[PDB]
Replicative DNA helicase (Escherichia coli K-12), 1774 residues
Amino acid sequence: KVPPHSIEAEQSVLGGLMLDNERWDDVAERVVADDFYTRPHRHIFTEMARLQESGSPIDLITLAESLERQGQLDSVGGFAYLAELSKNTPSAANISAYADIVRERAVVREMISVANEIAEAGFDPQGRTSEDLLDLAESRVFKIAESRANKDEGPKNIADVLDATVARIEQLFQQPHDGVTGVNTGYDDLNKKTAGLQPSDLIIVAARPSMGKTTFAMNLVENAAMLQDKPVLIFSLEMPSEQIMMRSLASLSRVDQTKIRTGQLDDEDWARISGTMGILLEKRNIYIDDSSGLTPTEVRSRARRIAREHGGIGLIMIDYLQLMRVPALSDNRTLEIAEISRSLKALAKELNVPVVALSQLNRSLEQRADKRPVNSDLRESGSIEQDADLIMFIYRDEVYHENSDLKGIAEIIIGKQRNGPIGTVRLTFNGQWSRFDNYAGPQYDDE
Amino acid sequence: KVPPHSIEAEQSVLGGLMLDNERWDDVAERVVADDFYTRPHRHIFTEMARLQESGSPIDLITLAESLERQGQLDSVGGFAYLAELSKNTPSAANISAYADIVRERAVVREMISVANEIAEAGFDPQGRTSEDLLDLAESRVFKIAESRANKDEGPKNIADVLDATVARIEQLFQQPHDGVTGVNTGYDDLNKKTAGLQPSDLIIVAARPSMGKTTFAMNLVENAAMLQDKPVLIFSLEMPSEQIMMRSLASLSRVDQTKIRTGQLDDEDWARISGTMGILLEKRNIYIDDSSGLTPTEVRSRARRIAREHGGIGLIMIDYLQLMRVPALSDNRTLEIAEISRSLKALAKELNVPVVALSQLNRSLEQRADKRPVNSDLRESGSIEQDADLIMFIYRDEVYHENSDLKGIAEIIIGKQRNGPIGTVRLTFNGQWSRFDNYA
Amino acid sequence: KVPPHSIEAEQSVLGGLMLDNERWDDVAERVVADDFYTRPHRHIFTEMARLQESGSPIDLITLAESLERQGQLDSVGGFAYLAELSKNTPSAANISAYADIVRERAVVREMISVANEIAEAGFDPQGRTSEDLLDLAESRVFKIAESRANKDEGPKNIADVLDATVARIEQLFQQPHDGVTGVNTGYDDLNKKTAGLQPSDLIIVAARPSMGKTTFAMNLVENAAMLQDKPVLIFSLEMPSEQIMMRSLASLSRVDQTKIRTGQLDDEDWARISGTMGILLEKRNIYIDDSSGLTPTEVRSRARRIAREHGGIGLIMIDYLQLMRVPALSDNRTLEIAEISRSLKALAKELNVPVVALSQLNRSLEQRADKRPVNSDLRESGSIEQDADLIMFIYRDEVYHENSDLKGIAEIIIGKQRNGPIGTVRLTFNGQWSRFDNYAGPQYDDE
Amino acid sequence: KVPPHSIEAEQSVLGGLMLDNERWDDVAERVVADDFYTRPHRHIFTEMARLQESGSPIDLITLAESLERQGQLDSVGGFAYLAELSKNTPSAANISAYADIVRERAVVREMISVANEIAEAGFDPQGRTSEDLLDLAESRVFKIAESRANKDEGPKNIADVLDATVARIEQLFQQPHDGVTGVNTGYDDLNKKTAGLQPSDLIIVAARPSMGKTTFAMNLVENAAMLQDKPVLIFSLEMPSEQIMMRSLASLSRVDQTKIRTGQLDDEDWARISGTMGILLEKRNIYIDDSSGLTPTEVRSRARRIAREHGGIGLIMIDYLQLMRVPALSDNRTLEIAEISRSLKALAKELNVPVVALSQLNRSLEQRADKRPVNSDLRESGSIEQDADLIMFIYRDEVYHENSDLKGIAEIIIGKQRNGPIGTVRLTFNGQWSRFDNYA
DNA sequence: TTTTTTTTTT
Ligand SMILES: Nc1ncnc2c1ncn2[C@@H]1O[C@H](COP(=O)(O)OP(=O)(O)NP(=O)(O)O)[C@@H](O)[C@H]1O
Ligand SMILES: Nc1ncnc2c1ncn2[C@@H]1O[C@H](COP(=O)(O)OP(=O)(O)NP(=O)(O)O)[C@@H](O)[C@H]1O
Ligand SMILES: Nc1ncnc2c1ncn2[C@@H]1O[C@H](COP(=O)(O)OP(=O)(O)NP(=O)(O)O)[C@@H](O)[C@H]1O
Ligand SMILES: [Mg+2]
Ligand SMILES: [Mg+2]
Ligand SMILES: [Mg+2]
């Protein structure tokens, strides 16, 4: 058969090197002359490397002279072939991608050649035992993996991790500057464990229905918007934006939401709401999309659109994940949830922004005597625990027990925190204003 | 005939995508791969989408390589075809218009195909009745409408929401509704917490059997009909309309239901019932559908019919959700529950009408020592808690405990209330009259 | 293609109208002249409508004269064609079904024509937008539905229900009753609360094993048979019919069942049994089927057969519901029970007959200290509670407690009564005679 | 090409099975029906297996009758072919060697087929990445190696048990190991009782994560590394590399972890950290490879991979053993933990490494009245009470009791210990630096 | 996912 190769990518790389010499470093880091399929291409890249190591700039005339001095001008195709290669390449903007393609082709060809050698050894043992052939095959595959050892790698070795250790110590010397390392949550206790909303983090705040989960998420959004100027993006899939705005005005102005909903408001609270609206129009960093049944592709497109138009996005609010709908994986809810979580994590890593993705719980919580939520108590759990890093659960024993002494005290229990120890953050909930504040009472030592 | 297509617009879109990658978002929002008439164009757009999702820029060489890796380079026409497509397109200034034309052609061809399928079903009944074919055609046309309704989406600025909110607040402040924002329940305490039956709300009042749940729902219906002129629509799937009317007459005239059911009534109560009938004929806003095993689509069609004919609908009553039948998801009951709840919520949002749908409970409530209902006590809740916003539960400790001091006292406990606090409303129940009144 | 039409049905309708004029109203309500496929048939029906509106009877000669006066006799086919149409039709008994068929064909042809119009509009946009075409298609399909909406509808009016209710009230008030409006139970206290066995009611009397459950059901059956002449239908799923008849003779003649079982009976009780058999042969209204593992479809077919043969059914006795077998829902018992209960309630509403179906209880009742049955004690509860209306439970503290003073006293406690207050009716049970009788002892005040 | 096969050896094996039924066990252990090159030979061996499992002796006539009953007599070549096969074989003395040759041929053909599959995957990527192809090839070679396994169980003879027992007695008596026998644990009480970190052992410490258990395993890793240069491996599923590094620096340098995490600039702690990392660089055997969500078979494969890389594993640190949750067994964790423990013991015996795991217990450790880790506090008891060879339980009464009865005498209670006296091992812990010391 | 009903055991 024909070995898998991309001659066009090689020609594009050679033309870009003939035009641009600053991107030679990326090519040298990525590929070598052996990655070139044709032996003339290997000779051309070898001459280019020799000229660049000598400090000579990479152009057509000097390369032609260098090939003529070594006599390789006729071996590579002549000066007309080099001129054609220089002519064909428009630009070297995507020469890194071309080099990646060439490296992939070289890896596949090396794998095919190794497979041919292994099959030849299998057909003709030549006195080698089965264990000998197995070890030879393992060594060959490990050598193929070792060819990209600096590319495919994970945690580092002792010396390199010690250099990373001293570098991180020098970095964390600068850490006591504000205490909050990410987006400020507005809560002192929350900014101690989590140290604020870290970028590229999946924040899963899950609670029972009518537990203030949307309310606390809105409070977090308000605190972030007052503590930053980067625009936020809200996807209120469950509730309309009218109720969201009513909750925001009740929380910020500390006025009863019932009176706002009935509209029976005095002029003093009206002036407070007007001042809050003036502050919001000063900010104008909030964008709410109340459409329901949206795919993660649409959300990603809108997020990229806003980031392009408004210069990045401060916060992404999602109104609970089981409302999100994918037509492709609508057959199975768990597959749909896993796909949604994976796409949202990819988007969060893409734009480097903490995404507020709420979630619901299961009915096994009420079955348990202790109604403190766990990771397995999550509605369609599993992949959610895998993809997320900042999972939290709202607990209100006042709701479950009428005689509970934790009235107003809402406990945010961290289920998963990859970077930092988990814990229980107590907060003071005001149902009238729907306001979550820092718990100013006596601190409880978690047993 | 030749299907209506604009291949030149497709070529212009593909060439503009090859030239410009910044307007890729507009093309992705407008059209998909299936909108392309020719299958090679579908493959080309699929490869472009795969490359752009990976972050790779859209150029000729990378696209050709990507098609070569999957072996689809020869399927789409070869690299020369791609080079020709890149050469032909001058610019991508009007690529949005070309994509709109392509989407229009695709939707028109979809409509033509649906019409052909409808004609085929008409010529070949395959044992289906005319109603089945009509409902299938309605479903197909609704699907085509949903395919076009996705354009009206997009995040909005905070200022517009603020203006709408303050306008609504001023409207509520000017109107002296005296707390009751929605449809008046007829109960003062219920008009304090819920502030009346708000439009586009899914009200789930679930209770145990023989708890007056249907009776209390009928009392709510009577109160709404007396306190409004907008016509109501009743779907009495479980109980016959005759029993519903007897319960209504017993409740409104405050006469014993047993005496009315036996017919042993004096002429004074007869005159009271006659006056009640005169008031009802003065209103004539009540329409009861005692049919059972109904799909939500039939309910939606009848609701739209009555709303257009009678100028909107004040209230939509459902006689307990597990009686409803969906043949599509009849294999699993929870799928039926989720579909019914979603369809009812969508219908309530559509016609802006409060819908009161009853439900049943589970035996786990009986297992608990305290028999106060919770959200998990719902009979296959699932998305019931998520979609609904005005869930209430009826509690009568007099039934469970003979020595209970809550005789006549019915506790309507709000399981879920998104806007406002939840609580327990005490009411006075008259078994003889089957009358729910405010507790004193 | 050929449009879907039934010329034979049209010819049958025309011949029936030529023969029968009393069923013209059904045809006019069902179909119009436009529903006829062929234009001559439209002309014929138009002429028939014109003659009937004028009051002229619909016969061959007058119709021929009317067509001759308008000159349409040649257009419809001639007098010989009309004579052939009159000849071919045997009878007009099924002319309503024929008109329904013609209406169906007309609706299908209308749908096909509308689909053709929509396809033509799709092929030629004529400058219309896709929204315009969608609205036009919706309008056309809704016009088809509205043409099909000119029939019996679900929500009719409140006035019709009011008239039916007041007619029922007048019917019940003009008849002097003894507090019984349904089938008389034969027990005075039961006739106070339940007011007799009401038709279209699912009566569930459930108890423990033994406990005289089938015995009490048979006592109710005997009382109903003695107090009415409408035939009753028993499905003795559990017990053989021989033992059923032995228990019936023991209860009715007040003789010990054990002596009848042994056959050692005196001539006086023999004469009493002979007189009871003479009374039964005077009645001859009870029809018993002892077949087991029956589907509800077979039961419904047999019930319809008996009602057609013997002019309705007075009462339907079902001997214990878990004996009923459905092959389709044999996988899950609860689904099978729900389907059986739904089918039985549909049958009871269909024929307007009281159906007393027996059932069993759960062992959790024995787990409780107080062994008074509740709704949840029902075996495979839920749908049983929902579909039924007259649920009762048998309680015998004499069985549970040897020192109980309720010996002979059986408490029938109403668990569910949709219309009326529930209670506890105590009866006198005779184990020797196996006879349930009205309470001759002190009636205890229920708390 | 012609696949490498030895039909003559197959004929010899089949004829020997026809002659001798006593050596059927050797052939059944060695080869299967799939190892036969020709499908008729596979059918013949399948019929032989079916006859011998039924207890019927394997002869020509019964085999032919069974093949005729299944209709396979004509497919394999007829009765004359079977008679020829029986005639050809002289004896069954060397049938073991012939079966070994047949197994070798089958394994070589399997390797050739796998190589052909890999070459096909290389020629046709089908959208898969090169990493996917490499992982698939490694999986295929590992499957070949796993299929190249042999007998693992068997009732041992009394002589072998006596030899092992007397060897154990001589080890306990004659050897003057003076406490430590394997890798030095560091804790003096663990040095005496557990006799060091014995290679090919299963040491599972059952406690709460970030509650002294993580720093206990960290101190174990440190003490093991300070006395040997054998490459140790890190598999922490609880904390990242940076946080584990901070914990290790705080433990070794005796510096408060608040200063380690929150930067308190001073040169004394910096000098202690510099000395600690100098000692670590002197050891030069800490290879970080911590991840999450794995299985012990994957851990064994990575152990083989590291042995290919360097060779020899000093210690593997499994932090948060309850982070490998399989959703099938996530609810009842006992069976999953038992299977993980058995596979970890198999891995420990495989590469001679003292596999140490950090099992997570329940919240009842802080809730139950019995604050010590007993079956209620253990995760559904079961695999935490048994199975594991060294099940240590960290009764840190500091966390469980606010007024602790164990401050510096926190009990490392050993439920089961193969070598050493069980009991409550009271040890000192420094909460400031997260450092576990050794109480006398 | 949901939802019933049985034993065992802690
Ligand atoms: N005016 C008010 N007075 C008192 N409590 C109120 C008022 N308005 C709202 N609440 C409470 O605030 C909470 C509303 O929380 P909310 O965030 O809307 O629930 P939710 O988490 O979004 N529901 P879900 O999405 O199904 O989980 C409830 O506990 C209400 O009782
Ligand atoms: N005339 C009457 N006298 C006394 N009590 C009565 C009378 N009529 C009805 N009741 C009681 O009032 C309640 C009415 O029951 P009902 O309205 O059917 O509740 P329900 O929820 O609709 N039953 P279900 O459909 O199974 O859930 C029951 O508790 C009856 O026992
Ligand atoms: N001669 C007798 N003397 C006393 N008790 C008797 C006599 N004959 C029958 N019984 C009682 O009659 C009862 C049987 O009633 P029956 O109605 O058949 O129960 P059942 O319906 O068969 N229960 P089940 O089998 O679960 O459906 C038992 O309690 C017997 O003790
Ligand atoms: Mg919410
Ligand atoms: Mg009801
Ligand atoms: Mg019985």
The longest strand of chain B covers residues 409-417. The CA atoms of residues 185 and 196 of chain B lie 5 Å apart. Chain B has two domains: 1-123, 165-440. Strands of chain B lie at 156-157, 202-206, 232-235, 286-289, 315-318, 355-359, 390-395, 409-417, 424-430, 435-438.
